[PDB]
Design a protein around this ligand. Structure first.
Ligand code: BGC
Length: 92
């Protein structure tokens, strides 16, 4: 019971990040690709190192917008530094 969001409906910058992830970078930030530990269990509970985070650029500081990836290619959107998540639907 996480909400879905269509990939094509995400901010352009979020879609940019999904494209860089698919290309394995090079990434704009040093912390791109760091483990996300899911300490609040907002994403499905998995083993250590399952999730990683990547910055979604904000025009005008690094900012709060992120994509989180899972180990089998799951993709999640969070505009607010992991306060909230939506599962990215790659089909729309
Ligand atoms: O992620 C840590 C740092 O990565 C660097 O590549 C960026 O230039 C910084 O703006 C960023 O804060």
């Amino acid at each position: 019971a996480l909400a879905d969001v269509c990939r094509t409906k995400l901010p352009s910058q979020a879609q940019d990040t999904l494209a860089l992830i698919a290309k394995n970078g090079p990434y704009p930030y040093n912390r791109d690709g760091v483990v996300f530990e899911n300490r609040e269990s907002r994403l499905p509970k998995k083993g250590n190192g399952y999730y990683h985070e990547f910055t979604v650029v904000t025009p005008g500081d690094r900012g709060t917008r992120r994509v989180v990836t899972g180990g089998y290619g799951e993709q999640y959107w969070s505009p607010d530094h992991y306060a909230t998540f939506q599962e990215i639907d790659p089909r729309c």
